[PDB]
Design a protein around this ligand. Structure first.
Ligand SMILES: Cc1cc2nc3c(=O)[nH]c(=O)nc-3n(C[C@H](O)[C@H](O)[C@H](O)COP(=O)(O)OP(=O)(O)OC[C@H]3O[C@@H](n4cnc5c(N)ncnc54)[C@H](O)[C@@H]3O)c2cc1C
Ligand SMILES: [Mn+2]
Ligand SMILES: [Mn+2]
Ligand SMILES: [Mn+2]
Length: 498
């Protein structure tokens, strides 16, 4: 059927858009290919933890996987599983694996909650056509409040066993002259203190994050999406995947939408039409829809920038072996709280998460997720044979990112007389994981594939809202930027277009 506005997906861009549309009185249908995560499972919990993965952990895979960095300790808990509509999707391209959330809330279900504003000077570099004053004066504050960002208590952090791992890396970094910063989060840190005191059910302190948090984490289903539903003007249909988009002969857009069950069986194929169409299917999903539409002739006036300009936010993972006298602890909160800010906008820039590890026994490993400044970009290229966009990124394109991460961590190793681990990513000696991405950015870049508010070039009332807009890099964990940009865009689009 017809609905005035359709939003594809339910991640950050989508959720912001739908809230503001509903508040403007626009009846809005959100179409989400994953589940609404609210049914207690066989362990009584909605989500599986990292030490008890099951089919809930994975989007249509036949075996669970260890969290990256932890195969040596967590492969023992891996099991064969039925393909199921689980929460975390490892999307494999030829030389890159991109991890995304699947469900009501998108990546907010599976991410580490880290809510970080980009450096203004870097924002101005990457998006020079955007007025940075309204971003910092209005939209970043709006995002901060709506997301329910909060801050860890410094004395609790300093004292608790659950953050020893962070304190160890802080001390090691400090010997190299490198500073750390606290990382704001949407996980309720008050709740986390109570978990450590045995006062409330554990989640972050029970090895949960990447397959969802049963408590504590204010994912988008609790924040923007709950508010959107509260307007009375928004509904969400789950296990509904948009496959194609066309402009109807009489105006507006028509979608082919597959409804599946949680086993992936096709239940129905529906045609859903609308006046206003907002894409919030993520860097991968929105880009694939538009490359498909261009190259199959259903949106033939899309431009050549559709598909272009993808980067992995410079993501690189690495690990150091601590001295025996610097154990990192068996009990590590699953929510990071500290990072190393070595980002000055130069090509040497690194902003690196001090990542917890879930093994739950002492390994002496410090793990890091580095965000780097690497100019290389990929393109999503439609394959009509398999009906898939394929990302053409090759591993050598991450060499600048590896080189930056390695220069930084080499300083820390030199100051401390430590070495890397080489065995965390596979049997081949490899200290830097260079073929994964948690932060996909680009494919439908703001001001190139779209105008400076995400209006898709060549079309009226067709909008992109999400990580596909960002030009490959933001220098920090990306969801606050996606959120704030979406606030900016939807406010302007509603004013001028709706
Ligand atoms: C392991 C991990 C850790 C992370 N940690 C952090 C962190 O701590 N902080 C941070 O800032 N970022 C973090 N990120 C990144 C962050 O989660 C993403 O940048 C963000 O979720 C992207 O938002 P989005 O709106 O672009 O898309 P998404 O959040 O990916 O949402 C897209 C939604 O659209 C749905 N969808 C896709 N295609 C279709 C379709 N055709 N039809 C219907 N529905 C569709 C998806 O199922 C999904 O629910 C992390 C991500 C991962 C995977
Ligand atoms: Mn604050
Ligand atoms: Mn519980
Ligand atoms: Mn030393």
């Amino acid at each position: 059927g017809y609905v005035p506005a359709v939003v594809i997906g339910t991640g950050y861009g989508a959720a912001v858009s739908a809230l503001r549309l509903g508040e403007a009185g626009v009846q809005t249908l959100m179409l989400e290919m994953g589940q609404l995560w609210n049914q207690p499972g066989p362990d009584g919990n909605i989500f599986c933890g990292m030490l008890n993965p099951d089919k809930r952990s994975s989007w249509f895979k036949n075996r669970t996987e260890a969290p990256l960095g932890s195969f040596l300790w967590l492969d023992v808990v891996n099991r064969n599983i039925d393909p199921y509509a689980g929460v975390l999707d490892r999307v494999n391209y030829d030389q890159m694996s991109v991890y995304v959330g699947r469900g009501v809330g998108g990546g907010s279900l599976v991410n580490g909650g880290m809510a970080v504003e980009p450096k203004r000077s870097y924002f101005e570099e990457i998006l020079p056509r955007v007025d940075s004053s309204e971003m910092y004066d209005r939209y970043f504050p709006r995002a901060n409040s709506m997301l329910r960002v909060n801050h860890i208590d410094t004395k609790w952090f300093e004292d608790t066993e659950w953050y020893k791992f962070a304190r160890v890396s802080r001390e090691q970094a400090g010997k190299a002259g490198l500073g750390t910063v606290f990382v704001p989060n949407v996980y309720d840190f008050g709740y986390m203190q109570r978990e450590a005191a045995g006062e409330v059910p554990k989640s972050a302190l029970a090895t949960e994050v990447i397959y969802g948090n049963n408590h504590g984490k204010q994912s988008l289903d609790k924040t923007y999406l709950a508010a959107a539903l509260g307007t009375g003007k928004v509904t969400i249909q789950t296990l509904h995947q948009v496959k194609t988009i066309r402009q109807t002969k009489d105006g507006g857009y028509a979608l082919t939408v597959e409804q599946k069950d949680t086993d992936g069986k096709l239940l129905a194929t529906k045609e859903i039409s609308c006046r206003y169409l907002f894409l919030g299917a993520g860097s991968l999903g929105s880009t694939e829809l538009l490359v498909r539409a261009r190259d199959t002739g259903t949106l033939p006036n899309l431009n050549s920038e559709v598909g272009a300009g993808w980067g992995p936010n410079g993501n690189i993972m690495t690990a150091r072996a601590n001295h025996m006298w610097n154990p990192t602890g068996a009990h590590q909160s699953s929510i990071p709280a500290l990072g190393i800010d070595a980002w000055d906008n130069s090509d040497s820039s690194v902003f690196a998460e001090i990542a917890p590890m879930p093994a739950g026994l002492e390994t002496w490993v410090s793990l890091y997720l580095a965000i780097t400044k690497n100019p290389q970009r990929g393109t999503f290229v439609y394959d009509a044979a398999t009906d898939r966009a394929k990302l053409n990124w090759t591993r050598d394109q991450n060499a600048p990112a590896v080189n930056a991460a390695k220069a930084l961590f080499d300083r820390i190793n030199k100051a401390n007389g430590t070495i890397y681990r080489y065995d965390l990513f596979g049997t081949q000696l490899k200290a830097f994981a260079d073929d994964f991405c948690y932060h996909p950015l680009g494919g439908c870049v703001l001001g190139k594939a779209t105008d400076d508010y995400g209006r898709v070039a060549g079309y009226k009332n067709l909008y992109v809202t999400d990580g596909s807009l960002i030009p490959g890099s933001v220098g920090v964990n990306p969801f606050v930027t996606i959120t704030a940009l979406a606030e900016r865009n939807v406010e302007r689009i509603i004013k001028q277009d709706v």
